[PDB]
Design a protein around this ligand. Sequence first.
Ligand SMILES: COc1cc(/C=C/CCCN2CCCN(CCC/C=C/c3cc(OC)c(OC)c(OC)c3)CC2)cc(OC)c1OC
Ligand SMILES: COc1cc(/C=C\CCCN2CCCN(CCC/C=C/c3cc(OC)c(OC)c(OC)c3)CC2)cc(OC)c1OC
Ligand SMILES: COc1cc(/C=C\CCCN2CCCN(CCC/C=C/c3cc(OC)c(OC)c(OC)c3)CC2)cc(OC)c1OC
Lengths: 222, 249, 233, 233, 196, 196, 204, 222
Amino acid sequence: QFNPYGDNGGTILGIAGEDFAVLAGDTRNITDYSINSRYEPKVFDCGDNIVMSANGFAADGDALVKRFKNSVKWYHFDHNDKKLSINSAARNIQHLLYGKRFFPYYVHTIIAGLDEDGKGAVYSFDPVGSYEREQCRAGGAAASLIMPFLDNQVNFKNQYEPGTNGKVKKPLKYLSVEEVIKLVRDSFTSATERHIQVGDGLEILIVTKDGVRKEFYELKRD
Amino acid sequence: MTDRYSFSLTTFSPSGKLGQIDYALTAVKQGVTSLGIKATNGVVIATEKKSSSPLAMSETLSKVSLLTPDIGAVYSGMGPDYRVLVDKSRKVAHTSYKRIYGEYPPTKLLVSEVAKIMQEATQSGGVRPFGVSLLIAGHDEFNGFSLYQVDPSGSYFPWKATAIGKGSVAAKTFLEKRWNDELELEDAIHIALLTLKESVEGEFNGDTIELAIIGDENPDLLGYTGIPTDKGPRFRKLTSQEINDRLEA
Amino acid sequence: TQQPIVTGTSVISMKYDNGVIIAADNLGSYGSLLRFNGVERLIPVGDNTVVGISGDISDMQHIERLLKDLVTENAYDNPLADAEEALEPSYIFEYLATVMYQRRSKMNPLWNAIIVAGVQSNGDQFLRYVNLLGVTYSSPTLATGFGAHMANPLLRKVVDRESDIPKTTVQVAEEAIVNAMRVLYYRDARSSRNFSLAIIDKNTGLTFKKNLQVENMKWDFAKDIKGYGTQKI
Amino acid sequence: TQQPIVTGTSVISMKYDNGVIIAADNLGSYGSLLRFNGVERLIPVGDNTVVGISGDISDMQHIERLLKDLVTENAYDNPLADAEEALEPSYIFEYLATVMYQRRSKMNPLWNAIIVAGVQSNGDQFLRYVNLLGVTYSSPTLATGFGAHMANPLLRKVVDRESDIPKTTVQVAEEAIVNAMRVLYYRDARSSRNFSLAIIDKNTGLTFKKNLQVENMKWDFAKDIKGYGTQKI
Amino acid sequence: TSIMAVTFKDGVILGADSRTTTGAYIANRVTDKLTRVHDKIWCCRSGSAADTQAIADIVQYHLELYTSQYGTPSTETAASVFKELCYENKDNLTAGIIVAGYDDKNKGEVYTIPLGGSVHKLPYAIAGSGSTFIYGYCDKNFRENMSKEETVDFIKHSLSQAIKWDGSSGGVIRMVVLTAAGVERLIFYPDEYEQL
Amino acid sequence: TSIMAVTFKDGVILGADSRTTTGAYIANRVTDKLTRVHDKIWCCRSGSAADTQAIADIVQYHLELYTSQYGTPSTETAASVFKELCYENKDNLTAGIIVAGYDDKNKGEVYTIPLGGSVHKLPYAIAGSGSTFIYGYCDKNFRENMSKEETVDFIKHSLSQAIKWDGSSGGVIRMVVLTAAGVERLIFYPDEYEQL
Amino acid sequence: SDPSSINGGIVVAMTGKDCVAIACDLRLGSQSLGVSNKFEKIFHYGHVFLGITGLATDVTTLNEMFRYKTNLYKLKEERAIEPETFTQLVSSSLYERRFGPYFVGPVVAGINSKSGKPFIAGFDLIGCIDEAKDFIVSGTASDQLFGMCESLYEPNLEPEDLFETISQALLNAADRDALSGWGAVVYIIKKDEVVKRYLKMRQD
Amino acid sequence: TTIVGVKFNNGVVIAADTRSTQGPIVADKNCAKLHRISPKIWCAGAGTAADTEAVTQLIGSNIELHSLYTSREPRVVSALQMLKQHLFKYQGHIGAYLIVAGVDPTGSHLFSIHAHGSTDVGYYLSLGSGSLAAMAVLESHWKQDLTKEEAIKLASDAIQAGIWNDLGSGSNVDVCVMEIGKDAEYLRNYLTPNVREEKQKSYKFPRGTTAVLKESIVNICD
Ligand SMILES: COc1cc(/C=C/CCCN2CCCN(CCC/C=C/c3cc(OC)c(OC)c(OC)c3)CC2)cc(OC)c1OC
Ligand SMILES: COc1cc(/C=C\CCCN2CCCN(CCC/C=C/c3cc(OC)c(OC)c(OC)c3)CC2)cc(OC)c1OC
Ligand SMILES: COc1cc(/C=C\CCCN2CCCN(CCC/C=C/c3cc(OC)c(OC)c(OC)c3)CC2)cc(OC)c1OC
């Protein structure tokens, strides 16, 4: 019979920095073993210095992105052009999602920007609206390949101070946007080696107090 | 159908001899002479290609057989028993070795396996022992070069050099006083050529003599290139032109 | 929730320096039965847009008349329906896309895969795809069904990245499409020799070629093929 | 355990005062495709027995071979192979009913329904049924498939019980059978017009009629029939 | 069942066997599958008899209402009412319908509406279960603008083959002729078409 | 698959299309479905390609052994061997085979062994998915004792029709002529039979 | 109901310069329930090492079986088996059960005592051989392991450098796996000597 | 997997992609899918890998054993008959899908075998997930009377179409050229167009980073 869902592949990643935030995804779009496109962006600027990715079933992903963009615009209309802060956008998104609790949006959603204190923010969502603010989150195909790496090379997990022999944890001094980007790139190149869904291209959106910047890097095409 | 011989055909006599094995052994003694020599860098096995009628074909008479690309065998005695034994031998090298470890058996192991087949024929119901002795020459990587003799009893032993069949006692004596442990392959071939001469009653050329070497890897005989880790067979049967060519000595 | 009855196979297409090309064979199959040979599956809307439809043919005809209604209604109270406020390729796409995702969401899909091809007013090439799930994507080449597997690899050899498009001429583009249609005829069991092809160029406008045949086929070597292994005669 | 592929439909039969008549049409169906028309489904065994067969045709062909072989072997070391020790109808049937049952009991049946018709050497009529289940029974009338639904009710009007058999002549009984065959051709969608019929009479022996056709059909009234309730033209 | 409609010079002829079956049992052997939805607009029905009688009844009602408001409907319009009912109710119908009729503007016309609710205008149309067997025959024998006698024979032969092979078909061959002259009903009995 | 064998004046001809599919993908467009089992005894393969090849392979063996022992086999003998295999292994096979052979006593002969194991001797036989569409045509157009060029034409036309309608048929038309004169292989390409 | 995931466990092996490393977690669970913290999954037969993840009963059975076979190999061949040859023995023994296989994922590691060349290899449950010169992973956290290794790995790492890498890759992957953990073991292997370190990890 | 076979004027060439996949994970980025049956009969395999090697070696073993018995060079048609009769026996449960090519005393041969036991003959063939992309190329550029160099290029482009356009295929192209009067030529990694870019960072750790509980020597000697 008719099955209303599909999988389009893709992998996405968000790291919340100090005064910045990044949200990256591959630009490949797949169906089974076929490539639909080598460039089909999946990470979007939504206004109010908020970036969003809804990865998984692509038709569902775009429905959700469109609805949220609409929510931002209508929030302006209804609240004297007030800025939709990231935490509010996050609560808004829970409700968008939970509204379809019995015919879910088959997607895993991440948003990124800056909170009210200027600190970097990343929010991660269920397909049905459950959420948390997080330091960093990968979602989609290669998420299980990237998540352990980021655990290690970002939170310095299982690393201890040389010579103390596991008595002093290696201290987690935090990272420039430039270092965060190297980590993102190496995560994706590691991803595309070992996962058939990840490849083609990497688009990264960078959120600063000065707004949203975009960067692109090619990936292996096989 | 109705094979009712489930009892053994080789028994112990009261003297303690196993008659049928002695008789098989005897049939070997009356077989054409063949010999082997181990050099430092190779082995040679050799025998006489005694044509019955000159209408028979020389090549058709193989007494020297590849078993494994690094293992050859030759015999004295009943030739049909040998042909059969060769085919069991080749099959067992695959069946109990190549298909399990992914490589050809080392030379002693293949030998103990031919030995096994022969022993059973001295004990299984309804059969007689094989009427052959084999010399088997090979090279594997951990034992290097080796040369074995296997008898109809199932016994086998490693030799620096030996011979079986008719002229064995003369050949063994002559071999004993020419073998040192510093022969090149080439020397041992020449010695094998000498020792054969005495035992060969008549015409003595490259078409009446059979010769094999277990030597260097012949990547010319591989049939394919592209895998450097795979070199050619170490086994090589000499051509009549090759034998004749160095018969000038 | 339905199941398709009368069907159309691949729609294939790409974009070249000045516009787009889109092709589709003229057949509606009824399962294994090759039932209807006159089926036009390229739907022109205006003169900047062709819409190629594969999938259920009853649903295509429905979509087809939606498009006419869309042209009629655009021209209501519109003195600019023949310029500036004429139908744009992207408008026609967003509409279809909207309907597709809505029908999927009602658990009663329009059982199709659509490729919308044309040239926007500014001059930009438009090429996008939507299917019975409402899934959408764009690429310099696009294809449905078998075309996805056999046509796309041939077409991507010509236009493999965006930077290849201003390099590709109409002749080269049109060449590829025709060869692809032949390969499909060789290897797709639901396909047809007769097909239609449309070119929408930013300077020549819409060019629509009907009743094309697959030509230049290699069949000769079939005389030498005997048996399935050991037979010599 | 299997399923029938090429199949034969009704076999009908009854007994009259001096013997038995049995009949069967000449069709081998393949699902709804009426594939083979020269299929003989009545099988005479010597000269006092006809076995009529419906069901799977490959299985019929097998039973056919079993019956020639039964005849070959009855001859072996039997100087009375055509006298006091010829194949009797009761012998052939008991044989057959035995194989069917074993075949069902191995869960691999012969997909058939069988009627064995004949006259016993003492003059007695033989008529008995057996099918894929090994089930057996006798009656003055017997039919398989649609025949048991349509043919029996007609045939039973000529011969309701035992005492009716002596009163039933061969002219009457044959006419009843040919009628029933026509009814079957009217109403059974897997039937054919061409059929075969056999009489096994205790004085005249085995008479075997072939290439019969159903004749005297009433179709004319159909011209006066129009629409499906409300139509007038 | 086996049904067809063929266009020719003077108009259009519809044909059908007269067998409806419930399994292997022939429920009706004198069925009339040629159905009037207007004076010169007829249909061939196949599929569920209930679904197909009901659809025809509704179409008859629609064109009758059409007629009293806007005069005589086009064959094309009859086809449209059919498609509309068949397409929008595709989940709950098993109907395959050939619509055929005559105009003085348009002459003979044939539309086939298969299980889709798709609609197709053809020079001729075959359908029903018996139709598969005569696909080759009809493709080799249809000529455009045949005479009435030619066409009646082309249908006679095709339908006799379909009936021959398909056990779902049989009984009489019925025809309905649609010309400017009007409406002529033909019948052909087994003994006639069997021996062809 | 579309296949047939037809007997004529001087023997018998076999025809097949050349298309093998898995799903809707044509895995081979130049297949040879005409298979030699003896010099003058060939067969037509339809069904599982594995099953059908494996069965032919075996029959060939059986007839090669028969030959050694008893001289040249009759076309009916070849049929019985196909039959035995097919009927005895009916649960695990999906094969429809046509068996065709020349022999001086009874000239050309055609046997059909469909699914199941039944065996049918006939003037001609058709089989394969494509066969359903040409039943009407073949029946109208077959006559016995045709010339060799009439029989090639009859087969070329039937098959081109079969190919036109069946998506699981296509490619080239292969024929094999079994005559007293010997064995001839014919081939017809699309640009030839499509224009028919 | 997925036999390869009842018990949990992982194994990873890497090559460095004139050395190899092989490591496993120590967990044996019955689905959600942790049962043992001492279920080592790495075995040795001479200088050849075998790691086995998958169904615990088969792990044990397979280890006892290659013990038995490699013992016999020694008695006949008069030498120890080499990693290349043993890989072949593993492959063919698994294929003997092609239609009722052991539900395991073997990994072989060792140095060739004649060539000195470092060797690792992996198999599926029916014996297909994956020989690679970089790393081999197996277990319930194999995707995690793949992600870690592909990032952490350099060629030619000295033994003590290699130790750091292999440990960090195992540790960090088991931590993203509900079915792995409870301890870890790492073998650093050179033709000379072999060192075995137990690791300190979270116990949850 | 993408494998092809192309006959040329005086021989036959086969090629294969280099990627092995567990579901969507790349398990081996560089495996050889080209198998020797006998020195001049090569095989390309797609499907269940264990079956692809096991069936190839069993027939290989037997082909050798049989050529030693008969004192003849092994024939391609014998590999074919032995493969097919073995696959057929197993009713498809041995997932072996093979392109078997080679040269022998009778000439040059190209066959394909499906798991169920059916075989095909052709001048060009493909198998596997990349089958359709490769065939698209073959079907467009093939012509009778190819030179050896043309057939290598043609075969190699076919594998390429699979690498790029098929998610089941990638990395490298292996080729094997079996010409009539010469040795079979086996070009492992004949093409290596998927070399990983340099990473942005080095993930080498400080020594002592890892926490250790116990250290111990293992005994590997008698
Ligand atoms: C003459 O009156 C009758 C009418 C009928 C009813 C006729 C209706 C036929 C029903 N169907 C047959 C026609 C075909 N069909 C579907 C086709 C099957 C192919 C599967 C498929 C699925 C897809 O879905 C994803 C496809 O799209 C990619 C696709 O590609 C073409 C193919 C299903 C339905 C039956 C009769 O008895 C035998 C009868 O006789 C009295
Ligand atoms: C791609 O298409 C194909 C598929 C196949 C493989 C599958 C085909 C199966 C077709 N069947 C046709 C035969 C019919 N069938 C089942 C129904 C059998 C009839 C039962 C029956 C029993 C009776 O009494 C025991 C009957 O009489 C009362 C009766 O009346 C019809 C019917 C199922 C199977 C084989 C092909 O040719 C070799 C082929 O090409 C055309
Ligand atoms: C890593 O290795 C791989 C493994 C696999 C998994 C195995 C491959 C399967 C191959 N096939 C795909 C499926 C289709 N197929 C046959 C179709 C089914 C036949 C059953 C059938 C039987 C019948 O009875 C005769 C039928 O008739 C009733 C019938 O209906 C028409 C269907 C044949 C071949 C797939 C891969 O590609 C991504 C792959 O990478 C190269």
